[PDB]
């Protein structure tokens, strides 16, 4: 419940503050102190364990993941595809 | 790399901001709601399409870069700015370059491009050159002052020109990146001979 | 003559050749025809009438497929006769203008689909304006249907208040036409009102045409224009703001009112405007348009008090104060911005009425001169009864103020002659608490 | 009318109008200067100042008339609104002084905004000079006497912004630099959208000759037109590129004059738009045809400032700026001769920074994409610039590869390789073309 | 009130420009910024400043 989740950007800003995966944005360069390969691998393992927890009780992933209100499954499928 | 791909579009958005400063040097008087209503409020059709091209460039750069600004920019800006994809029917005050409220979009974007460019030239100018005094202002930035290239025409053939193939007598194929030749090629075409922006 | 017959045959086959390329419909094709006709005119006993003889012989032919069973013919013949500077007959103004009238083009999306044909916004403007001024001679009936063409290839409608934008040519959107000798003449040509009765559907194709038709109609046929266009205002209850702007543009251009005819005409126009206000609702006042209506009715009051100077013409400011009464008594209460707004507009309106009353009463009252004491402005008590009887809200003034004005006007008279006039059968009609009689 | 002494009113409001203005807080603070200027030229003695009074009163008439249509007519009745204002009456004493203070406080921000629109960069002093010819004051009192060509919108401490980032007291020589520049660039965008890029110069000069500024400048005779043309050259270079000198600006003015004459020498003989070669809009055509070929030259004068001194002999020994845009080639030649004169004299390290900073512009000039077309002499000069830069750049690889290496690691080999620098220099002055056999064999044997 | 208007104008001038710190205020008022005669009373007041 509102924990500083791993591999998120930082200026705190808890949660899963990331946009739609069909974004025209930059390639998500690694943050404050980390190599890019460890960053994208840790992001991938993180999104896999949040999705495993998201298949059980999606209301807790609505109260964790910030912008949507509709569904967790397709959003994270697009993220795992990317 | 993906942010220096878009420094080519910086004199265009500075042409935008100079024309808006030159046109709208007022306060609480601009009565335009949305950008599309202002763009159709011009009679000379070439200037309409010119503003359309520059605003399409500005919206594409903004939709690209709107995630590093709130975590790496020095100007702390809120989250009601970059939580949507901007379009031609959005609000009009996002292009007038103010410094406190909702006009931090244009100013924060130009200042962050200047800060990225000046951080990388500072890294170059600390490693090997050790001194230079070449520094130009932001009043005469033409196209030839910013780091500009393309990836599918200008970056990929230089890097592809330095993958070296080595075959031993036993029979192998080792790919080696001789980093000195790629450094000398990348340095003496793009990122040497450039100013330190103020 | 035999070479000229071959010249005519070459002309008819080249005109057929450039009519054959007109079947694909794009601007890229249309750019080529101006290049083809310029080179055709460059290479051509050859008088200048023989060039126009071949052009006039074809143009009579394609009315027969097109009058019954078609915009590209009129733009093509405009390119062909602008391309030579050639006088047309008056009787051919009956046909060529009908080639431009956008029948079966009633959606505006089809006009935006026809827009990429005519993308350059500058050459055609001079072309349409010279054609308008060329056909402005006394046949002049069909040229009102060319206006929907020249109102779709430029900027949208400016919604601002009057005397801010510019005078009438920018609001209406003509900018090259001297209509002012034509609304003010001997109107022997009333065929525009029949043409506008017949061709009503063109009001669906844009927003400029109702405004430009308002600035072309004569005064005695303007009330008929508002009665024939009730249902278009039922479709959109915003164009009465355009009616207010058109009358506030049209009134001060007229000078002082001197006849009974203009009295009948302006009274008829004000009864139809009050009628079209009070039929529908305060849905006219929607989405915070009320302030602009208030500024327009104050400007309209100011421009109608400045053109009445005979005091038997009190019916017209009487109408213009019952109109602001009706628009005030319909609006919704929201806060105190509306309350300060209604107080300020009512104060300025009563200030305008009082400054009108001080403008034409530049002498005394009840000068005797005959031992048969009579008013010098003989129909005066009707003016005071009429301008006092409109019911403003009485938390404001209008009754503590104008009656005090009348009291200050009455004590300027000596008491003997005043009392002799008060029972002289010209202070008649004690009207059951008629408040000027209590005064 | 005689209802109010308007001249006394304007002269009273000048000081309070000018004292609210501020510049960018060091950019030639001229408040007392503007007071002296306006009070010298708001009189009725000269017909210059009389016509300026009549036109300033006409601009005040139309700007207050557009300003007071927004009023609700209870503030238009200003005498009655001010007599009901008790505090302003008892603050100004009598009634007529109170009314005059009211008209002064109305006119004063309008005059201040008017000075903020006129005095953009120094346009007033062109009236304050003596011995200025008829084109200066005639063009100044043509542009200021037109409402539609020169809009003045209105709005406290109002900001007037500088455009020329100028030196001490510039006073731009054309009477309005910025309005003609923005008008001609609007005309440029409309001209290059209407027609194609073949009759662009013809349509651009003809659409210039249509405008009222064009038919105003045509009745000037030839000499004032030419003086206006060199003045507009100098101010256009000060407007576009910030240049930190006086004599760099003279060489750029000859260079853009060479560009304009070159572009007028491009077409053979139409002689109908070359019945006006001495006209304003050619400047913009020259810049829009040659912008990189000027800007690179600006960069080759901004990184290396001393080479301009060498250019201070060059036009005295070549007599350039007559036929073709040639100053880039002599600046390239003078810069390569400066680097070939010394090779070691400040230090080897500072010589490497100076040659690596000028590597990019000097390599850009010797490319066939930059020099699209010119005469054969400019192409011949670029081949010698190519050869001399190939020699200097090969020396730069040799220095940065062996000399700083043996100055960093093993300081026991420098008096040998510093001799072999001169040995490679003596073997290479004859043939500077490494694409053939003999200098390649010579460099291998020397190594 | 007249004196306060005069000195708000002159402080608006003295703020965004330079000033000689001597030079008694009348010889600033009538000749430098060329101000006319408002009233003699405020000038007899400002004579010793």
């Amino acid at each position: 419940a509102n924990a500083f989740l791993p591999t998120m950007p930082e200026d705190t800003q808890t949660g899963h503050v990331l946009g739609s995966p069909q974004s025209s944005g930059v390639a998500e360069v690694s943050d404050r102190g980390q190599s890019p390969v460890v960053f994208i691998l840790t992001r991938l393992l993180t999104h896999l364990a949040m999705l495993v927890g998201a298949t059980h009780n999606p209301q807790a992933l609505t109260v964790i993941i910030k912008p949507w209100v509709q569904d967790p499954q397709g959003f994270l499928q697009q993220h795992i595809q990317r | 790399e993906a942010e220096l791909r878009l420094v080519k579009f910086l004199p265009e958005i500075l042409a935008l901001q100079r024309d808006l400063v030159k046109q709208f040097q007022n306060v609480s008087r601009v009565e335009y709601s949305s950008i599309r209503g202002f763009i159709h409020s011009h009679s000379s059709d070439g200037l309409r399409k010119l503003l359309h091209d520059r605003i399409t460039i500005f919206l594409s750069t903004w939709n690209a870069l709107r995630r590093s600004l709130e975590t790496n920019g020095e100007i702390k800006l809120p989250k009601d700015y970059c939580c949507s994809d901007l379009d031609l029917d959005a609000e009009f005050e996002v292009i007038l370059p103010r410094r406190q409220g909702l006009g931090l979009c244009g100013t924060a974007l130009v200042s962050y491009l200047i800060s990225l460019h000046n951080n990388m030239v500072y890294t170059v100018q600390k490693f090997s050159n050790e001194d230079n005094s070449y520094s130009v202002d932001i009043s005469e930035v033409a196209d030839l002052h910013v780091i500009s290239y393309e990836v599918e025409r200008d970056l990929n053939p230089l890097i592809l020109s330095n993958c070296q193939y080595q075959v031993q007598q036993g029979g192998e194929t080792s790919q080696e990146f001789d980093l000195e030749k790629i450094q000398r090629q990348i340095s003496s075409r793009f990122l040497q001979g450039k100013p330190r922006l103020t | 003559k035999e070479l000229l017959k071959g010249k005519k045959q070459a002309a008819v086959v080249m005109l057929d050749r450039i009519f054959s390329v007109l079947q694909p419909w794009s601007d890229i094709n249309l750019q080529s025809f101006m290049t083809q006709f310029l080179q055709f005119y460059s290479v051509v006993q050859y008088e200048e009438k023989e060039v126009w003889t071949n052009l006039w012989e074809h143009v009579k032919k394609q009315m027969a497929p097109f009058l019954e069973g078609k915009l590209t013919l009129g733009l093509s013949i405009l390119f062909m006769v602008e391309a030579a500077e050639f006088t047309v007959p008056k009787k051919d103004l009956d046909s060529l203008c009908y080639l431009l009238i956008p029948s079966a083009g009633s959606p505006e999306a089809l006009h935006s689909d026809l827009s990429p044909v005519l993308r350059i916004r500058q050459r055609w403007r001079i072309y349409l304006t010279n054609l308008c001024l060329r056909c402005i001679d006394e046949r002049c009936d069909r040229w009102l249907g060319i206006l929907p063409l020249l109102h779709t290839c430029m900027q949208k409608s400016p919604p601002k208040k009057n005397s801010k934008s510019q005078p009438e040519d920018t609001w209406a959107g003509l900018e090259g036409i001297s209509f002012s000798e034509f609304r003010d003449k001997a109107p022997t040509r009333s065929q525009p009102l029949q043409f506008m009765q017949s061709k009503m559907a063109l009001l669906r194709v844009d927003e400029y045409l109702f405004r430009s038709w308002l600035s072309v109609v004569p005064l005695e046929s303007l009330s008929s224009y508002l009665e024939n266009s009730i249902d278009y205002l039922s479709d959109v209850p915003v164009r009465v703001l355009d009616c207010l702007q058109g009358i506030s543009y049209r009134l001060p251009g007229l000078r002082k009112i001197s006849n009974q005819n203009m009295k009948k005409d302006v009274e008829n126009v004000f009864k139809m405007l009050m009628h079209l206000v009070d039929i529908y609702q305060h849905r006219i006042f929607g989405e915070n348009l009320l302030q602009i209506y208030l500024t327009e009715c104050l400007t309209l009051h100011e421009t109608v008090c400045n053109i009445t100077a005979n005091h038997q013409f009190f019916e017209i400011p009487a109408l213009s104060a019952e109109l602001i009464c009706k628009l005030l008594e319909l609006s919704p209460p929201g806060e105190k911005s509306y309350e300060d707004l209604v107080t300020s507009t009512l104060q300025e309106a009563l200030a305008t009425t009082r400054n009108w009353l001080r403008s034409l009463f530049k002498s005394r009252m009840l000068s005797i001169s005959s031992a048969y004491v009579r008013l010098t402005y003989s129909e005066e008590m009707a003016v005071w009864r009429r301008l006092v009887e409109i019911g403003f809200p009485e938390k404001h003034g209008w009754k503590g103020s104008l009656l005090g004005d009348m009291e200050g006007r009455l004590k300027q008279e000596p008491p003997r002659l005043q009392i002799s006039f008060f029972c002289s059968s010209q202070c008649r009609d004690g009207g059951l608490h008629d408040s000027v009689s209590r005064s | 009318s005689q209802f109010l002494d308007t001249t006394r009113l304007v002269q009273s409001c000048v000081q309070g109008a000018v004292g609210m203005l501020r510049d960018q807080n060091e950019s030639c603070a001229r408040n007392m200067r503007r007071v002296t200027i306006l009070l010298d030229l708001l009189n009725e003695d000269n017909t210059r100042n009389a016509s300026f009074l009549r036109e300033s009163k006409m601009r005040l008439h139309v700007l207050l008339n557009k300003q007071e249509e927004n009023q609700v007519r209870s503030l238009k009745e200003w005498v009655t609104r001010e007599a009901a204002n008790q505090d302003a009456l008892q603050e100004a004493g009598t009634f007529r002084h109170t009314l005059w203070k009211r008209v002064q406080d109305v006119v004063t921000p309008i005059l201040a905004s008017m000075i903020a629109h006129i005095d953009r960069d120094g346009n007033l002093e062109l009236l304050a000079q003596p011995d200025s010819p008829a084109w200066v004051q005639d063009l100044w009192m043509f542009i200021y006497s037109d409402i539609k060509f020169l809009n003045i919108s209105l709005v406290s401490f109002i900001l007037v912004q500088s455009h020329m980032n100028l030196l001490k007291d510039a006073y731009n020589a054309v009477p309005f630099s910025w309005r003609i520049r923005d008008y001609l660039e609007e005309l440029w965008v409309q001209a290059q959208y209407i027609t194609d890029t073949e009759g662009l110069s013809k349509k651009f000069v003809e659409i210039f000759q249509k405008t009222p500024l064009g038919v105003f400048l045509a009745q000037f005779p030839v000499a004032q037109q030419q003086k206006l043309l060199q003045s507009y050259l100098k101010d256009f270079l000060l407007l576009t590129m910030k240049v930190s000198s006086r004599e760099e600006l003279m060489f750029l003015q000859m260079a853009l004059w060479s560009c304009l004459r070159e572009l007028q020498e491009a077409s053979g003989t139409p002689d109908e738009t070359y019945k006006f070669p001495l006209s304003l809009p050619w400047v913009h055509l020259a810049f829009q045809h040659f912008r990189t070929r000027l800007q690179n030259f600006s960069r080759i004068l901004t990184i290396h400032p001393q080479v301009l001194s060498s250019l201070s002999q060059a036009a005295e020994k070549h007599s350039l700026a007559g036929c073709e845009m040639t100053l880039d080639a002599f600046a390239a030649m003078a810069c390569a001769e400066m680097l070939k004169g010394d090779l070691l004299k400040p230090s080897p390290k500072a010589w490497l920074q100076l040659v690596k900073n000028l590597s990019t512009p000097l390599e850009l000039v010797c490319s066939e994409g930059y020099l699209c077309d010119s005469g054969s002499m400019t192409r011949s000069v670029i081949q010698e610039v190519r050869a001399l830069w190939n020699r200097i750049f090969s020396i730069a690889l040799f220095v940065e590869h062996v000399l700083l290496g043996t100055e960093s690691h093993i300081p026991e080999l420098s008096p040998l390789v510093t001799t072999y620098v001169s040995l490679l220099d003596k073997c290479l002055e004859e043939d500077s073309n490494l694409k053939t056999c003999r200098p390649f064999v010579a460099v291998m044997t020397t190594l | 009130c007249e004196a306060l208007s005069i000195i708000e104008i002159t402080l608006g001038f003295l703020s965004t420009a330079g000033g000689d710190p001597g030079m008694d205020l009348n010889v600033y008022i009538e000749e430098v910024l060329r101000m006319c005669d408002q009233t003699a009373q405020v000038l007899k007041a400002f004579s010793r400043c």
Side-chain angles (χ1 to χ4, degrees), chain D residues 164-183:
Chain D
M164 296 176 73
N165 263 321
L166 54 87
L167 58 80
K168 181 63 69 177
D169 191 72
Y171 58 102
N172 49 353
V174 70
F176 285 100
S177 302
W178 64 277
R179 182 61 189 165
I180 63 172
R181 183 182 182 269
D182 293 27
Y183 183 67

Side-chain angles (χ1 to χ4, degrees), chain D residues 20-253:
Chain D
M20 82 186 178
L21 296 171
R22 199 181 299 138
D23 54 330
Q24 280 77 12
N25 71 19
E26 294 293 328
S27 297
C28 187
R30 282 173 59 195
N31 285 128
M32 181 294 287
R33 285 290 299 94
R34 290 180 189 96
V35 169
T36 55
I37 290 314
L38 281 296
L39 291 170
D40 284 332
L41 59 89
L42 283 172
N43 301 113
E44 283 285 82
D45 46 358
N46 193 358
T47 61
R48 183 197 48 176
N49 302 324
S51 179
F52 179 70
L53 268 178
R54 288 184 291 114
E55 279 318 296
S56 183
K57 285 168 61 174
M58 211 60 78
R59 202 144 299 267
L60 285 169
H61 180 270
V62 298
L63 192 153
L64 281 296
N65 196 1
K66 180 250 294 173
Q67 193 267 329
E68 292 280 274
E69 293 293 328
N70 200 5
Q71 304 302 291
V72 66
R73 186 264 186 189
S74 70
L75 272 74
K76 298 181 184 179
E77 300 295 325
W78 59 280
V79 175
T80 309
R81 189 263 186 276
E82 187 50 5
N85 190 358
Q86 179 178 1
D87 218 331
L89 289 163
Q90 65 189 2
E91 182 88 357
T94 186
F95 177 64
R96 305 171 76 190
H97 195 202
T98 309
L99 188 156
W100 192 69
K101 287 284 290 301
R102 177 60 189 164
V103 193
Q104 191 173 4
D105 291 331
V106 173
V107 171
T108 301
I110 302 299
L111 183 64
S113 178
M114 192 76 107
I115 299 310
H117 196 284
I118 294 166
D119 194 4
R120 297 289 291 191
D121 46 3
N123 294 316
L124 281 298
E125 294 181 355
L126 268 61
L127 283 296
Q129 290 298 109
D131 72 10
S132 297
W135 65 265
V136 176
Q137 282 84 14
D138 207 354
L139 185 55
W140 200 94
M141 212 55 258
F142 177 73
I143 301 173
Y144 185 61
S145 66
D146 203 58
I147 303 89
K148 59 100 178 178
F149 180 76
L150 187 61
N151 264 317
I152 297 174
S153 285
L154 77 165
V155 297
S156 181
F157 293 67
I158 188 168
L159 186 63
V160 53
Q161 58 264 70
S162 66
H163 288 350
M164 296 176 73
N165 263 321
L166 54 87
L167 58 80
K168 181 63 69 177
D169 191 72
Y171 58 102
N172 49 353
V174 70
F176 285 100
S177 302
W178 64 277
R179 182 61 189 165
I180 63 172
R181 183 182 182 269
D182 293 27
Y183 183 67
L184 275 190
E185 288 187 354
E186 193 276 333
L187 202 62
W188 181 257
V189 173
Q190 183 175 1
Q192 76 180 0
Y193 178 63
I194 287 174
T195 306
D196 53 356
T197 317
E198 284 85 4
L200 182 57
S201 68
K202 187 195 55 55
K203 282 292 301 302
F204 184 57
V205 298
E206 211 293 326
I207 201 58
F208 181 76
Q209 188 276 331
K210 281 295 182 286
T211 200
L213 182 61
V215 305
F216 175 73
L217 298 177
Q219 285 71 241
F220 284 172
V222 189
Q224 276 73 245
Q225 288 177 358
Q226 294 152 261
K227 298 188 286 292
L228 182 62
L229 187 58
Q230 289 89 22
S231 297
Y232 182 68
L233 288 172
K234 184 184 33 185
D235 54 60
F236 181 110
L237 282 296
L238 287 169
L239 278 165
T240 56
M241 294 76 98
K242 64 97 176 173
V243 287
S244 65
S245 169
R246 188 32 171 261
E247 65 271 65
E248 186 294 344
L249 184 63
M250 62 81 72
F251 284 115
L252 279 44
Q253 186 173 3

Side-chain angles (χ1 to χ4, degrees), chain C residues 138-418:
Chain C
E138 214 185 354
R139 284 301 186 151
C140 61
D141 286 330
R142 292 185 184 272
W143 57 281
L144 281 79
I146 291 91
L147 272 63
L149 281 296
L150 182 65
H151 290 124
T152 58
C153 61
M154 54 66 59
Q155 200 264 328
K156 67 200 279 283
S157 63
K160 287 292 171 179
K161 70 189 72 65
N162 196 359
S163 69
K164 269 206 59 185
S165 64
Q166 191 63 255
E168 301 190 359
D169 303 350
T170 70
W171 175 72
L174 292 176
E175 296 102 356
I177 298 172
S178 179
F179 44 78
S180 297
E181 68 274 12
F182 297 148
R183 61 177 66 180
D184 191 0
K185 61 179 287 293
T188 61
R189 185 64 62 192
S190 67
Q191 298 301 109
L193 274 296
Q194 296 82 17
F195 188 44
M196 294 181 286
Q197 283 172 357
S198 302
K199 301 293 183 183
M200 271 305 287
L202 295 71
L203 298 181
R204 276 79 66 186
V205 305
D206 207 353
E207 302 294 324
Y208 277 160
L209 190 65
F210 180 68
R211 301 179 176 181
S212 60
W213 281 2
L214 273 152
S215 296
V216 73
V217 285
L219 277 297
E220 72 269 12
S221 63
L222 202 153
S223 64
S224 62
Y225 175 108
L226 281 296
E227 71 201 89
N228 290 320
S229 67
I230 297 171
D231 58 359
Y232 180 75
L233 270 298
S234 74
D235 291 333
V236 58
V238 176
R239 312 291 286 166
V240 293
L241 184 56
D242 301 333
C243 302
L244 293 179
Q245 292 267 313
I247 62 170
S248 65
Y249 273 114
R250 283 178 59 87
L251 288 183
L254 179 62
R255 60 218 65 81
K256 208 57 59 181
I257 301 166
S258 294
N259 51 0
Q260 320 292 326
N261 289 319
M262 300 196 217
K263 276 183 74 88
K264 299 322 151 203
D265 293 332
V266 182
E267 69 174 1
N268 289 320
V269 75
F270 275 98
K271 35 174 81 176
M272 320 290 198
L273 189 158
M274 65 180 288
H275 185 272
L276 292 68
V277 167
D278 217 356
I279 46 172
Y280 300 150
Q281 205 184 0
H282 69 88
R283 72 185 179 184
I284 290 177
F285 294 156
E287 191 272 331
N288 292 318
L289 265 294
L290 176 61
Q291 297 176 356
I292 307 170
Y293 282 96
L294 292 178
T295 56
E296 290 176 329
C297 66
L298 283 46
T299 54
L300 186 58
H301 192 34
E302 291 205 330
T303 190
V304 72
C305 70
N306 290 139
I307 62 168
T308 193
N310 208 15
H311 87 277
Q312 297 171 356
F313 298 164
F314 67 100
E315 85 276 349
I316 315 178
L319 293 162
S320 296
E322 71 204 320
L323 196 151
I324 184 170
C325 180
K326 282 191 176 184
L327 61 83
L328 263 188
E329 69 91 5
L330 207 42
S331 301
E335 67 269 14
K336 302 296 122 181
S337 68
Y338 169 62
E339 188 70 30
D340 292 332
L341 186 63
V342 63
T343 60
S344 176
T345 53
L346 200 65
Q347 289 172 358
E348 187 277 333
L350 71 90
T352 304
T353 58
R354 207 168 73 189
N355 186 28
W356 176 59
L357 294 170
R358 207 188 286 178
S359 66
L360 74 168
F361 292 158
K362 291 185 174 72
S363 70
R364 295 178 70 246
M365 300 333 306
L366 55 84
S367 72
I368 173 168
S369 175
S370 62
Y372 202 57
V373 58
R374 85 158 50 88
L375 297 172
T376 65
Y377 291 112
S378 65
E379 194 47 289
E380 180 87 359
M381 293 312 295
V383 172
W384 290 95
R385 281 183 178 94
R386 177 60 177 269
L387 285 71
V388 165
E389 67 86 14
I390 295 95
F392 279 164
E394 297 87 357
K395 300 289 88 176
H396 312 96
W398 190 270
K399 184 181 280 289
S401 299
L402 201 72
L403 292 181
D405 198 0
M406 183 75 168
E407 288 170 351
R409 182 59 172 283
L410 277 185
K411 322 302 191 323
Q412 195 180 4
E413 306 296 326
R416 160 192 298 282
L417 195 173
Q418 168 172 351

Side-chain angles (χ1 to χ4, degrees), chain B residues 21-22 25-26 29 44-47 49-50 129 131-132 134 136-137 139-140 142-144 192-193, chain D residues 154-155 161 163 165 182 186 189-190 193 240-242 292 295-296 299 302-303 353 356-357 360 364:
Chain B
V21 166
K22 185 98 70 179
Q25 189 64 258
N26 286 316
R29 303 221 150 200
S44 64
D45 43 3
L47 191 49
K49 73 178 291 294
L50 180 65
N129 290 155
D131 281 331
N132 190 359
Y134 180 52
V136 74
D137 211 353
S139 294
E140 57 177 356
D143 53 354
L144 191 159
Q192 189 80 5
Chain D
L154 77 165
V155 297
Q161 58 264 70
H163 288 350
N165 263 321
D182 293 27
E186 193 276 333
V189 173
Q190 183 175 1
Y193 178 63
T240 56
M241 294 76 98
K242 64 97 176 173
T292 177
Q295 287 173 354
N296 192 1
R299 188 144 159 242
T302 45
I303 62 173
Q353 287 93 23
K356 77 174 74 79
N357 289 318
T360 303
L364 293 174

